[PDB]
Amino acid sequence: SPLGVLLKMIHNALRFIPVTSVVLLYHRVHPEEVTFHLYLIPSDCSIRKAIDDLEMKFQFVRIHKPPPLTPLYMGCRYTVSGSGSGMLEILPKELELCYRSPGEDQLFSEFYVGHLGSGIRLQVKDKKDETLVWEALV
Amino acid sequence: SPLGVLLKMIHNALRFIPVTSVVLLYHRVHPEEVTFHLYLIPSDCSIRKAIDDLEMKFQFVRIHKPPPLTPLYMGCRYTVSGSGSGMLEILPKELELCYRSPGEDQLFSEFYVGHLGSGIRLQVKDKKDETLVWEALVKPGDLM
Amino acid sequence: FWGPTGPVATEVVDKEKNLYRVHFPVAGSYRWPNTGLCFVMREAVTVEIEFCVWDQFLGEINPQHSWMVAGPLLDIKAEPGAVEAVHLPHFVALQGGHVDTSLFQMAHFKEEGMLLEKPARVELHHIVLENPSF
Amino acid sequence: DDPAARFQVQKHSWDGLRSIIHGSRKYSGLIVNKAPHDFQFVQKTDESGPHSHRLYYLGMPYGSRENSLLYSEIPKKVRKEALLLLSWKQMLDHFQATPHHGVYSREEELLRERKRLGVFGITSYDFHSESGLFLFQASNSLFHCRDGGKNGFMVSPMKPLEIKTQCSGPRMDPKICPADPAFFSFINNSDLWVANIETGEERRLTFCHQGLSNVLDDPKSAGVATFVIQEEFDRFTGYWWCPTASWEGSEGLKTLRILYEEVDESEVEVIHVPSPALEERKTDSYRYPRTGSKNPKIALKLAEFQTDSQGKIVSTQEKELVQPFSSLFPKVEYIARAGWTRDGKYAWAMFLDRPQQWLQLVLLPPALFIPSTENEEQRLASARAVPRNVQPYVVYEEVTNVWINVHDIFYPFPQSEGEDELCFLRANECKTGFCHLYKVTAVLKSQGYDWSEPFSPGEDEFKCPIKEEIALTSGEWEVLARHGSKIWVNEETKLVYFQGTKDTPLEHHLYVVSYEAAGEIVRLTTPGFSHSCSMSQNFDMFVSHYSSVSTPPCVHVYKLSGPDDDPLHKQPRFWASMMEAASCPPDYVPPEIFHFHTRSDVRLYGMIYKPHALQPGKKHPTVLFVYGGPQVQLVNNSFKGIKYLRLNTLASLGYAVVVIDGRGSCQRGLRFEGALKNQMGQVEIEDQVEGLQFVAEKYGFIDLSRVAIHGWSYGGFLSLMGLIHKPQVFKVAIAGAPVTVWMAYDTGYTERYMDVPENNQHGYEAGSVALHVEKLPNEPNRLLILHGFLDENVHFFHTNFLVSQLIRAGKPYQLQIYPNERHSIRCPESGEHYEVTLLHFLQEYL
Amino acid sequence: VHFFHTNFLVSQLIRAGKPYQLQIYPNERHSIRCPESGEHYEVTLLHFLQEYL
């Protein structure tokens, strides 16, 4: 044999190399209520196909939302919020981006939303310095 | 006396509480009353399909659940709490990672909910400092 | 690929094992749009591709959490010598700082072990190699 | 002075300190790796396959927790200028080698306490090259497997074959017979057994033990290493297989000898130590010899047995020397080491004196051992039957005025050229003051003895005269012999590979020299790092597990390569890499090594952890971490991140951490180590104070008013000596596991560093810190005593007697007990408490 | 009241990660009998109250 990408982080200092990542949202149409799943994941096709097969088994469909416009640090703590959050149950406070294999389910926030409508604000926000990296109207 | 040093804490125990998060929350729904199991057992990945097909053969249905933020350890004890714990029937509220073989059967935690409504929020903290290690809630739109 | 021919449908043999194939008739190529992986060659040939997965390959490597994965780990089953450049989709970091181009080292697996071969050059979203693309 | 110009440490809450220790633990799960060890190179013998060798070793792959037997495949060629990382192929198919929650036997936990091996799983294995046999001790019972002997090299992991038994208890210390790989041996219930893997046939050979009652009443053991030998002379076996087979010539029977150690521990004092099961509230008896008390009465013995062609134990036979061991060899208190010559002709043994100043190597030919029976006429019969010529040869006799460090390097050669006058290699520190290898040829001229009558040998009665003693190395550096280092003697090319400190004492480098002529010492490792190396048996490639103070440990495989006409200049070229240097923490600063000179112009080395986020001008509180005792060097150019992470935690809170290699420490020769002879405590603390004065002058952040001295085992002992004899400089003293009364400590250590109680009286009262308790401070919160309750080495009595004398002198203290931890804090929960207690104590009272 | 009781308490304090302080009287059975050891007990009690109460 397999050929692979660059793999390097120097021991002498932790750098937090930024990543080209993008989160994914899964909707429901058929069931009694509606649950989003936010996958704070990188931007590899293999990770996307792992999520696609698992969500297809789970009866979830991705809608293409606005991606992040900037690189953002691997492994860091990124709080997930929303204008519809708080009234609706975003499941963990701090989500994690750090890279995992496609062969397992990836790290996600569950988000029970109830009604889906056509748009609810979502938030993700850095915990190092509280700068916005992403927003999407769904 | 050749340097009886403390040796810090090796804690050679990580990355497995994610793969024992997926075996957690086994739900059985033959009537609308639902019962639940939890499993937390370290050190291998060939335990996963054995316990998964075990509960498949013993009529417990799957759901994908959040892995721990930081993975836990063995040789130590953890507590199980939440909205559904205490209110609904959790008889083993104490869990513990200790290694048992891929083939063999495991300690569980029996958890009845009855008519669950729309959600049962659950927790697995550590008994050391009660840090909020693990978070979940189950969904009747993902029940069988 | 969606190269000089236009949209060529990639032959999938099984969804479960992430194996893919194409036969690509013209010279060069254009990037496959799923992630930006691209290989360019000269002539009409068959290629098979797998996306090999790191979990069973990095557990064989001892500081597994020390390194950082920058992409897919695609294996290519082509004939030897007839691939002349491969572009693996590296994540963007050159937009920022403190990430060096003389630091990057490349993962070519074998049954023998990991070879950390130095790559040719890194794009904004790709890395190119030379003619021995094993 | 200037209270606005001194650093005040941010006082964290207790839960805060736990949060800090946990955040340290979040990456110590990364920084500990347990780098692979106990390498065994085997060639593939293919000449057409892809891989040149297979390296077998122990390792935890971090796909699993417990360490396991693994292998790598070393290829014949590598694409150069692009490094190859060897895969960690699992030799066995993911079974576990510890029971649930680490429950072991008491003898297993004692042996692991002795070697201080904290990691779980397969502790260590034994290997036989020709059969390709891996006999190891995993979980409940012994196991074995094979890979590439007369059979072939597997590619998938296999199953470990279990060794069934009718015996009860654990089967400790297993070894393969080299002459016959089907046979093996182990100790069970402190007697030597032997078995056979394929047929399952077992056989006890010794009957010095009966299991009638406790160890207070069943005192004789055989083939086991006693306490003082295990914990001070680093020998953990008391039996040695004969490496060759002789033929008795009755019909076809193949004899197989074993040298073993008979031990009569009747007169040695018994001490009771609390059991790990605190609920049971019972103790265990321990045969623990104090200073001046009787050591165990030792003797060497031959256990032979004879087997058929089919591999059944036909005959067996205990044998003993023609005269008693104590009478044939007076002044022999400890058998430091023993083994056999490679041809099998003679069984050698290193004896050692009570005062440890009269080490002598001796060869005991197997015909010197008659059978052992109660019948005194059979005994006399075989005393006549023993030939006149056979004789113990005191081959080598190291004598010193300081003490003999046990150097286990002894490589006797085949003596096929001129079949007398054994030629051997021998490390000798007492001659030049530094451990250097020598080639020594002693002439073995037997004078002829009548073994029927019993006589008393004289002072040097068996001492052979030396033919020659060429010194292969010389200088102000030393060859590593202790701490399980070794030499590798390529007799084909006539080179000897050793480890040493020739560049600098802070690093261990692999050197090679020829023993034909003491020529040029070739270093094989890169300088600027320190290396633990291990050669192939074919001497074509080695491993080096190396590190530096800045870089974490890596494990690289080098390959000796070059023109064969000059093998001494074969260039070690980096072939492949096994384990890379791990990711350092985000909040780890490497510590700075320094050196300085004393007023006597003796060079001491030291470390310092600078305070994180240092602001120049401010004075920080300084924790002098200390060990200071012999046979341990804290400062060397090696990675300090895994064992001394707490020191970095201290730095990250703002404490300057100073570490000084006081005089009396190892790695720096006998004259350096010997400044503590009969004055333990009286010179080390002065050197530590001097180091503090130096670091205070050099770096400007050492607050002399706020100095903590923290130590463990022997180091704590110094912390208490520091607070007694230098009270104005050390603000506090965290003494962990201190040796407070030397008169209670065991023979092997103390009888060496000091003497027998009647000899060095003022040395014992001056060094026993608990008898100078009146000089401890009147102030409270200046002394924190930490102690593991179940300790076997530095017993709880020491802390107990200290607290007793503090009570009698009316002096305050604080105390922390670790009721489960024996000597090293092993449980992570207890270690986390220990560190938060240390941070809290420093936070509040320093 | 055997020493095991204090020992097991300190054990479970260690396992739960809770601080303490501890004082041993190595030669005294159940009442602190010797007057010197009793004087230390009393000055430790006064000191502990003085500083932390």
PDB file of N, CA and C in Angstrom, chain B residues 1-13 15 42-43 46 70 73-75 77 98-99 102 128-129, chain D residues 18 22 25 28 32 65 94 96 100-101 116 231 627 632 643-644 646 712-713 745 794 824-825 828-829 832 834:
ATOM      1  N   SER B   1      19.072  -1.904  48.229  1.00  0.00           N
ATOM      2  CA  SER B   1      18.447  -0.673  47.760  1.00  0.00           C
ATOM      3  C   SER B   1      18.996  -0.177  46.416  1.00  0.00           C
ATOM      4  N   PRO B   2      18.572  -0.765  45.293  1.00  0.00           N
ATOM      5  CA  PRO B   2      18.862  -0.146  43.993  1.00  0.00           C
ATOM      6  C   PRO B   2      17.738   0.715  43.434  1.00  0.00           C
ATOM      7  N   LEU B   3      17.510   1.913  43.985  1.00  0.00           N
ATOM      8  CA  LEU B   3      16.559   2.910  43.469  1.00  0.00           C
ATOM      9  C   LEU B   3      15.135   2.353  43.404  1.00  0.00           C
ATOM     10  N   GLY B   4      14.545   2.196  44.584  1.00  0.00           N
ATOM     11  CA  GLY B   4      13.132   1.876  44.658  1.00  0.00           C
ATOM     12  C   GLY B   4      12.236   3.055  44.328  1.00  0.00           C
ATOM     13  N   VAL B   5      12.365   3.560  43.109  1.00  0.00           N
ATOM     14  CA  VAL B   5      11.607   4.719  42.650  1.00  0.00           C
ATOM     15  C   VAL B   5      10.131   4.405  42.459  1.00  0.00           C
ATOM     16  N   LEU B   6       9.316   5.455  42.445  1.00  0.00           N
ATOM     17  CA  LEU B   6       7.864   5.374  42.292  1.00  0.00           C
ATOM     18  C   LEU B   6       7.368   4.812  40.971  1.00  0.00           C
ATOM     19  N   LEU B   7       8.100   5.118  39.901  1.00  0.00           N
ATOM     20  CA  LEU B   7       7.813   4.690  38.517  1.00  0.00           C
ATOM     21  C   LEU B   7       6.545   5.296  37.925  1.00  0.00           C
ATOM     22  N   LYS B   8       6.135   6.440  38.459  1.00  0.00           N
ATOM     23  CA  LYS B   8       4.962   7.152  37.987  1.00  0.00           C
ATOM     24  C   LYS B   8       3.739   6.252  37.944  1.00  0.00           C
ATOM     25  N   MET B   9       3.026   6.305  36.829  1.00  0.00           N
ATOM     26  CA  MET B   9       1.830   5.519  36.661  1.00  0.00           C
ATOM     27  C   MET B   9       1.919   5.139  35.203  1.00  0.00           C
ATOM     28  N   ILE B  10       2.102   3.866  34.914  1.00  0.00           N
ATOM     29  CA  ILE B  10       2.203   3.449  33.528  1.00  0.00           C
ATOM     30  C   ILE B  10       0.906   3.642  32.747  1.00  0.00           C
ATOM     31  N   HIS B  11      -0.202   3.382  33.420  1.00  0.00           N
ATOM     32  CA  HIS B  11      -1.545   3.390  32.825  1.00  0.00           C
ATOM     33  C   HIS B  11      -1.523   2.942  31.365  1.00  0.00           C
ATOM     34  N   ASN B  12      -1.068   1.714  31.148  1.00  0.00           N
ATOM     35  CA  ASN B  12      -1.015   1.180  29.792  1.00  0.00           C
ATOM     36  C   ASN B  12      -2.408   0.768  29.326  1.00  0.00           C
ATOM     37  N   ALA B  13      -3.327   1.730  29.242  1.00  0.00           N
ATOM     38  CA  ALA B  13      -4.743   1.407  29.142  1.00  0.00           C
ATOM     39  C   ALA B  13      -5.430   2.582  28.453  1.00  0.00           C
ATOM     40  N   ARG B  15      -7.605   3.632  24.350  1.00  0.00           N
ATOM     41  CA  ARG B  15      -8.129   3.355  23.011  1.00  0.00           C
ATOM     42  C   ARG B  15      -9.078   2.156  22.941  1.00  0.00           C
ATOM     43  N   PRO B  42     -11.494  -4.843  28.428  1.00  0.00           N
ATOM     44  CA  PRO B  42     -10.416  -4.255  27.622  1.00  0.00           C
ATOM     45  C   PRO B  42      -9.613  -5.217  26.752  1.00  0.00           C
ATOM     46  N   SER B  43      -8.581  -4.652  26.118  1.00  0.00           N
ATOM     47  CA  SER B  43      -7.343  -5.250  25.593  1.00  0.00           C
ATOM     48  C   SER B  43      -7.431  -5.961  24.241  1.00  0.00           C
ATOM     49  N   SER B  46     -11.193  -8.619  19.019  1.00  0.00           N
ATOM     50  CA  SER B  46     -11.926  -9.825  18.658  1.00  0.00           C
ATOM     51  C   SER B  46     -12.965 -10.205  19.700  1.00  0.00           C
ATOM     52  N   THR B  70     -11.963  10.719  26.635  1.00  0.00           N
ATOM     53  CA  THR B  70     -10.710  10.086  26.990  1.00  0.00           C
ATOM     54  C   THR B  70     -10.976   8.649  27.408  1.00  0.00           C
ATOM     55  N   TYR B  73      -9.569   2.858  31.867  1.00  0.00           N
ATOM     56  CA  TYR B  73      -8.467   1.979  32.231  1.00  0.00           C
ATOM     57  C   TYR B  73      -9.041   0.729  32.879  1.00  0.00           C
ATOM     58  N   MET B  74      -8.209  -0.303  33.045  1.00  0.00           N
ATOM     59  CA  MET B  74      -8.658  -1.416  33.863  1.00  0.00           C
ATOM     60  C   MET B  74      -7.960  -1.347  35.214  1.00  0.00           C
ATOM     61  N   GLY B  75      -8.285  -2.305  36.079  1.00  0.00           N
ATOM     62  CA  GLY B  75      -7.798  -2.266  37.441  1.00  0.00           C
ATOM     63  C   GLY B  75      -8.432  -1.189  38.287  1.00  0.00           C
ATOM     64  N   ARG B  77     -12.447   1.179  38.981  1.00  0.00           N
ATOM     65  CA  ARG B  77     -13.894   1.053  39.017  1.00  0.00           C
ATOM     66  C   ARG B  77     -14.549   2.360  38.587  1.00  0.00           C
ATOM     67  N   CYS B  98     -12.128  -5.219  33.535  1.00  0.00           N
ATOM     68  CA  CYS B  98     -11.225  -6.301  33.885  1.00  0.00           C
ATOM     69  C   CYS B  98     -11.269  -7.265  32.715  1.00  0.00           C
ATOM     70  N   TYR B  99     -10.119  -7.828  32.353  1.00  0.00           N
ATOM     71  CA  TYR B  99     -10.044  -8.575  31.105  1.00  0.00           C
ATOM     72  C   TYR B  99     -10.709  -9.935  31.251  1.00  0.00           C
ATOM     73  N   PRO B 102     -12.033 -13.304  24.633  1.00  0.00           N
ATOM     74  CA  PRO B 102     -12.975 -13.029  23.530  1.00  0.00           C
ATOM     75  C   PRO B 102     -14.160 -13.980  23.457  1.00  0.00           C
ATOM     76  N   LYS B 128     -13.068   7.952  40.793  1.00  0.00           N
ATOM     77  CA  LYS B 128     -11.899   8.624  41.348  1.00  0.00           C
ATOM     78  C   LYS B 128     -12.223  10.064  41.732  1.00  0.00           C
ATOM     79  N   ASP B 129     -12.663  10.870  40.758  1.00  0.00           N
ATOM     80  CA  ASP B 129     -12.997  12.271  40.990  1.00  0.00           C
ATOM     81  C   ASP B 129     -14.339  12.665  40.392  1.00  0.00           C
TER      82      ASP B 129
ATOM     83  N   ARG D  18      -5.064  16.983  41.708  1.00  0.00           N
ATOM     84  CA  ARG D  18      -5.459  15.765  41.011  1.00  0.00           C
ATOM     85  C   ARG D  18      -5.671  16.021  39.523  1.00  0.00           C
ATOM     86  N   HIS D  22      -3.649  14.094  36.713  1.00  0.00           N
ATOM     87  CA  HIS D  22      -4.370  13.432  35.628  1.00  0.00           C
ATOM     88  C   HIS D  22      -3.986  13.989  34.265  1.00  0.00           C
ATOM     89  N   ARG D  25      -0.893  12.330  33.371  1.00  0.00           N
ATOM     90  CA  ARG D  25      -1.234  10.951  33.067  1.00  0.00           C
ATOM     91  C   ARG D  25      -1.892  10.801  31.707  1.00  0.00           C
ATOM     92  N   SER D  28       1.205  10.339  29.904  1.00  0.00           N
ATOM     93  CA  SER D  28       2.181   9.313  30.278  1.00  0.00           C
ATOM     94  C   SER D  28       1.802   7.936  29.742  1.00  0.00           C
ATOM     95  N   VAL D  32       5.296   6.274  28.351  1.00  0.00           N
ATOM     96  CA  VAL D  32       5.717   4.907  28.636  1.00  0.00           C
ATOM     97  C   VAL D  32       5.348   4.039  27.437  1.00  0.00           C
ATOM     98  N   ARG D  65      -2.182  -4.599  26.053  1.00  0.00           N
ATOM     99  CA  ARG D  65      -1.670  -4.013  27.283  1.00  0.00           C
ATOM    100  C   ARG D  65      -0.459  -4.762  27.821  1.00  0.00           C
ATOM    101  N   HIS D  94      -2.764 -13.554  20.724  1.00  0.00           N
ATOM    102  CA  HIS D  94      -3.453 -12.643  21.659  1.00  0.00           C
ATOM    103  C   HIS D  94      -4.165 -13.353  22.822  1.00  0.00           C
ATOM    104  N   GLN D  96      -3.748 -13.776  27.158  1.00  0.00           N
ATOM    105  CA  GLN D  96      -3.287 -12.948  28.264  1.00  0.00           C
ATOM    106  C   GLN D  96      -2.374 -13.746  29.186  1.00  0.00           C
ATOM    107  N   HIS D 100      -6.743 -12.185  36.506  1.00  0.00           N
ATOM    108  CA  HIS D 100      -7.589 -11.008  36.680  1.00  0.00           C
ATOM    109  C   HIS D 100      -7.072 -10.141  37.824  1.00  0.00           C
ATOM    110  N   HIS D 101      -6.932  -8.841  37.535  1.00  0.00           N
ATOM    111  CA  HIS D 101      -6.453  -7.802  38.456  1.00  0.00           C
ATOM    112  C   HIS D 101      -5.035  -8.082  38.957  1.00  0.00           C
ATOM    113  N   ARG D 116      12.413  -5.463  40.120  1.00  0.00           N
ATOM    114  CA  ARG D 116      11.692  -4.198  39.904  1.00  0.00           C
ATOM    115  C   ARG D 116      11.043  -4.133  38.524  1.00  0.00           C
ATOM    116  N   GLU D 231      18.696  -9.624  45.983  1.00  0.00           N
ATOM    117  CA  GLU D 231      18.498  -8.193  46.115  1.00  0.00           C
ATOM    118  C   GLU D 231      19.797  -7.407  46.217  1.00  0.00           C
ATOM    119  N   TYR D 627      19.136  10.514  45.134  1.00  0.00           N
ATOM    120  CA  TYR D 627      19.365   9.160  45.600  1.00  0.00           C
ATOM    121  C   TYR D 627      20.726   9.057  46.269  1.00  0.00           C
ATOM    122  N   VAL D 632      23.765   3.261  41.651  1.00  0.00           N
ATOM    123  CA  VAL D 632      22.696   3.972  40.958  1.00  0.00           C
ATOM    124  C   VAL D 632      23.248   5.311  40.515  1.00  0.00           C
ATOM    125  N   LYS D 643      10.693   7.855  33.940  1.00  0.00           N
ATOM    126  CA  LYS D 643      10.829   7.553  35.357  1.00  0.00           C
ATOM    127  C   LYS D 643      10.724   8.782  36.234  1.00  0.00           C
ATOM    128  N   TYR D 644      11.043   9.954  35.707  1.00  0.00           N
ATOM    129  CA  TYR D 644      11.058  11.148  36.532  1.00  0.00           C
ATOM    130  C   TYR D 644      10.086  12.175  35.988  1.00  0.00           C
ATOM    131  N   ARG D 646       7.362  13.137  37.514  1.00  0.00           N
ATOM    132  CA  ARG D 646       6.977  13.999  38.630  1.00  0.00           C
ATOM    133  C   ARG D 646       7.909  15.201  38.744  1.00  0.00           C
ATOM    134  N   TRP D 712      14.094   8.674  47.925  1.00  0.00           N
ATOM    135  CA  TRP D 712      13.404   7.410  48.150  1.00  0.00           C
ATOM    136  C   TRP D 712      14.419   6.357  48.476  1.00  0.00           C
ATOM    137  N   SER D 713      14.031   5.370  49.276  1.00  0.00           N
ATOM    138  CA  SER D 713      14.904   4.272  49.684  1.00  0.00           C
ATOM    139  C   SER D 713      16.113   4.887  50.292  1.00  0.00           C
ATOM    140  N   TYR D 745      19.633  -3.415  58.642  1.00  0.00           N
ATOM    141  CA  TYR D 745      19.614  -3.705  57.217  1.00  0.00           C
ATOM    142  C   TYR D 745      20.360  -5.008  56.917  1.00  0.00           C
ATOM    143  N   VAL D 794      13.335  -2.337  52.388  1.00  0.00           N
ATOM    144  CA  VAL D 794      13.497  -1.375  53.469  1.00  0.00           C
ATOM    145  C   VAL D 794      12.242  -1.450  54.314  1.00  0.00           C
ATOM    146  N   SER D 824       8.536  -0.192  45.774  1.00  0.00           N
ATOM    147  CA  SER D 824       8.197   0.807  44.788  1.00  0.00           C
ATOM    148  C   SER D 824       6.695   0.979  44.815  1.00  0.00           C
ATOM    149  N   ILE D 825       6.231   2.202  44.649  1.00  0.00           N
ATOM    150  CA  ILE D 825       4.810   2.386  44.653  1.00  0.00           C
ATOM    151  C   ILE D 825       4.456   1.818  43.310  1.00  0.00           C
ATOM    152  N   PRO D 828      -1.100   2.478  40.457  1.00  0.00           N
ATOM    153  CA  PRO D 828      -1.253   3.852  39.962  1.00  0.00           C
ATOM    154  C   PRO D 828      -2.061   4.767  40.859  1.00  0.00           C
ATOM    155  N   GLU D 829      -3.097   4.247  41.522  1.00  0.00           N
ATOM    156  CA  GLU D 829      -3.863   5.041  42.480  1.00  0.00           C
ATOM    157  C   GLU D 829      -2.989   5.547  43.622  1.00  0.00           C
ATOM    158  N   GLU D 832      -0.605   8.197  42.300  1.00  0.00           N
ATOM    159  CA  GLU D 832      -1.281   9.475  42.125  1.00  0.00           C
ATOM    160  C   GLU D 832      -1.481  10.176  43.451  1.00  0.00           C
ATOM    161  N   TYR D 834       0.466   9.692  46.131  1.00  0.00           N
ATOM    162  CA  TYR D 834       1.819  10.088  46.509  1.00  0.00           C
ATOM    163  C   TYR D 834       2.201  11.406  45.862  1.00  0.00           C
TER     164      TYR D 834
END
